[PDB]
Amino acid sequence: GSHMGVKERNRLEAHSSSVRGVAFSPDGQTIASASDDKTVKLWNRNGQLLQTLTGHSSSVWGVAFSPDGQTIASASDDKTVKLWNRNGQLLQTLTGHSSSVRGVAFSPDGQTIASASDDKTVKLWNRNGQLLQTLTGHSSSVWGVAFSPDGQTIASASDDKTVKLWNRNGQLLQTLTGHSSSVWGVAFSPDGQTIASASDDKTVKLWNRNGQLLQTLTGHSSSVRGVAFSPDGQTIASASDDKTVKLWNRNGQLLQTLTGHSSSVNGVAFRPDGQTIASASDDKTVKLWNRNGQLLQTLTGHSSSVWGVAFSPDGQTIASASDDKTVKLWNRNGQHLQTLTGHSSSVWGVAFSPDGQTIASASDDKTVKLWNRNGQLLQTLTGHSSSVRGVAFSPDGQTIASASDDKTVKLWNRNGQLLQTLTGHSSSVWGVAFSPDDQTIASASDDKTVKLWNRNGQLLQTLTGHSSSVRGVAFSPDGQTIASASDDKTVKLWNRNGQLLQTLTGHSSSVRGVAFSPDGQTIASASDDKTVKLWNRNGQLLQTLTGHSSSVWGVAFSPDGQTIASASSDKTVKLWN
């Protein structure tokens, strides 16, 4: 036989903590986001992840692109500024600030970089990366920094309630006084003639270079953390702790409010052609909007381990289930479609109905929940006495099976009425699957067995042979072969009489998940050893998918059999093809 090698194609992930800043490359093709998760991530125009910049040892507060878009700078709470290339390699680490670095900017010629710090200073560095100047003195921490379009003026925003304007020799040109509290952000208009400042006092102020106050933007109900001018200089965007972005004209009129973030908004940026807006939030997401107030896309991912994954029978949707208490729905292009919120503890399992319109989730909160594709909670299934570890839909789409630490499998209708309990396991049940025969169910248990049942509740067969917990189970497409995944480091293949047909050996730690391809020719297994392995039916290893940075807990095939999705405690789902 022949197995064509598959490769990693999409990464279903994003930041796992607050996003502090966003920036666009000069051509508008790339977005950089900076996070408390200690990383910067680079995204294409479709919101697909291109690269992660790893290396900072504390939260990243600012990010900027060079004028040609080939160098990224980042500013961190770790007291360093780092300069990177687009392959994610470190060019330079710049040290000298005595406290957190809160903001970073490149000069228009990109030969100079400016950094703003809690240490009350702004520092100017060359690309190589010698310190050129220290700008003193604000009387408190400096939170924002910007260059004028000609690069001859630097603006800094400070907790001392002022914005200061400086030349490149560190001479103070002007102080903008008037905010009644900390200034968190500053921006220049495109023509360099107007300065905007965002303040803890709930306002944005617009100034000229003489320090005269041209206009105050009032309407936010809390601190304004970020501000930006549109490329045409006619619109101002503001990002607020009130969870909104507001768009204004120069007369102070409110044009639009962008609602959708669920926590404070920290940063806002216009794409250089002015056709989209990006915002960064404490809700751990970046949101992309058009110039009409509509949400285009959310850059989001799980904030903790991903324990389960499922592919829709429609072939276009993937669901991931996470310790972060959410289920996320994604398309096959790696774009987020929807987040399902409401469980009060970890989600261990997820499944699609045969028509792809309903999602079921199994949770440590002891419930199964049913949802629609728009994210609406439709029903809670209550009855298990402990954590729910696995869930599946029948081929007819009207029965839901759940497996629990309470040693049972339960069968339910969509109104959450209990149709049947399957009792017989002597320990926790971690996996459950329906046969395509539309008659039988399989369960996998910590008691080291798989059990096969009729849907009327009768135990038909026990599969004995594993020497440790069994946590995954799957049927072949013809329903005649069962596969089980175990803590004993093997996958086993069985017939419906409980005869062992084959043992798949190779993983070097617990096997948490298994699935058969739709053509039944390929088996995939997910392991604590951080790999997915691909096998044929003779028990032969065909390929080892390496790429996850921690345990892999779940695997699923697309309906056409061409794509595999894997879920890991590295907080991501990967698509392979």
Side-chain angles (χ1 to χ4, degrees), residues 179-390:
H179 277 298
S180 62
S181 190
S182 311
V183 187
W184 304 132
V186 63
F188 277 95
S189 60
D191 67 9
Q193 306 304 286
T194 303
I195 295 100
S197 57
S199 175
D200 193 58
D201 69 14
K202 305 184 180 69
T203 73
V204 165
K205 285 172 190 292
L206 305 181
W207 316 79
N208 66 21
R209 281 169 177 263
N210 290 324
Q212 301 177 316
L213 180 60
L214 303 177
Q215 179 69 52
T216 306
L217 314 179
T218 59
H220 276 300
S221 62
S222 193
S223 171
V224 185
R225 302 188 173 179
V227 62
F229 278 93
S230 66
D232 68 358
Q234 307 308 306
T235 305
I236 298 95
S238 54
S240 180
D241 171 69
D242 73 12
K243 311 182 209 264
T244 73
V245 165
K246 290 179 180 292
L247 305 178
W248 320 79
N249 71 21
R250 280 166 176 262
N251 286 336
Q253 306 176 270
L254 182 60
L255 305 177
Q256 180 73 46
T257 308
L258 308 180
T259 54
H261 282 298
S262 31
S263 186
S264 306
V265 198
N266 296 316
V268 60
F270 284 88
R271 199 168 82 184
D273 62 354
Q275 307 300 305
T276 70
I277 299 162
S279 56
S281 173
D282 275 350
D283 71 9
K284 316 184 197 72
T285 76
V286 171
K287 286 177 186 286
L288 298 176
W289 317 79
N290 68 15
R291 299 296 299 264
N292 221 349
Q294 336 200 243
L295 180 60
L296 298 181
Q297 192 173 354
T298 306
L299 315 181
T300 179
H302 293 292
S303 57
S304 187
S305 303
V306 190
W307 304 128
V309 69
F311 241 108
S312 173
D314 63 57
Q316 300 296 337
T317 311
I318 297 115
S320 48
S322 174
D323 205 53
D324 73 14
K325 309 183 201 161
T326 73
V327 164
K328 286 173 186 284
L329 308 184
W330 314 82
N331 67 20
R332 234 158 124 177
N333 289 325
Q335 303 168 313
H336 168 270
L337 306 171
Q338 184 72 46
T339 299
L340 304 185
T341 56
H343 277 299
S344 52
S345 195
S346 325
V347 191
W348 287 92
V350 66
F352 282 96
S353 65
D355 73 350
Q357 301 306 300
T358 306
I359 299 92
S361 52
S363 179
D364 188 62
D365 66 18
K366 309 183 301 269
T367 69
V368 168
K369 284 170 194 296
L370 305 181
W371 319 78
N372 73 18
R373 296 177 71 93
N374 279 338
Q376 178 191 341
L377 181 61
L378 305 171
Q379 190 72 38
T380 300
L381 276 43
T382 57
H384 282 297
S385 299
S386 189
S387 317
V388 196
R389 305 287 185 185

Side-chain angles (χ1 to χ4, degrees), residues 71 113 161 187 487 528:
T71 303
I113 302 101
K161 308 189 291 157
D487 278 19
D528 178 66

Side-chain angles (χ1 to χ4, degrees), residues 131-194:
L131 178 64
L132 301 172
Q133 193 77 37
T134 303
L135 278 46
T136 61
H138 283 293
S139 298
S140 193
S141 53
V142 191
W143 285 82
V145 66
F147 277 99
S148 62
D150 65 7
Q152 299 315 294
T153 300
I154 300 110
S156 56
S158 173
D159 175 70
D160 71 8
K161 308 189 291 157
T162 74
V163 166
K164 290 175 179 284
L165 309 180
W166 315 81
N167 72 17
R168 292 165 164 280
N169 286 321
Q171 295 171 286
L172 177 64
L173 303 175
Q174 179 81 45
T175 304
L176 287 26
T177 59
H179 277 298
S180 62
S181 190
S182 311
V183 187
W184 304 132
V186 63
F188 277 95
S189 60
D191 67 9
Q193 306 304 286
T194 303

Side-chain angles (χ1 to χ4, degrees), residues 25-27 64-71 105-112 127:
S25 63
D27 61 5
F65 283 96
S66 67
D68 65 10
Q70 308 308 289
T71 303
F106 275 95
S107 66
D109 62 22
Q111 299 310 286
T112 305
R127 294 284 279 263

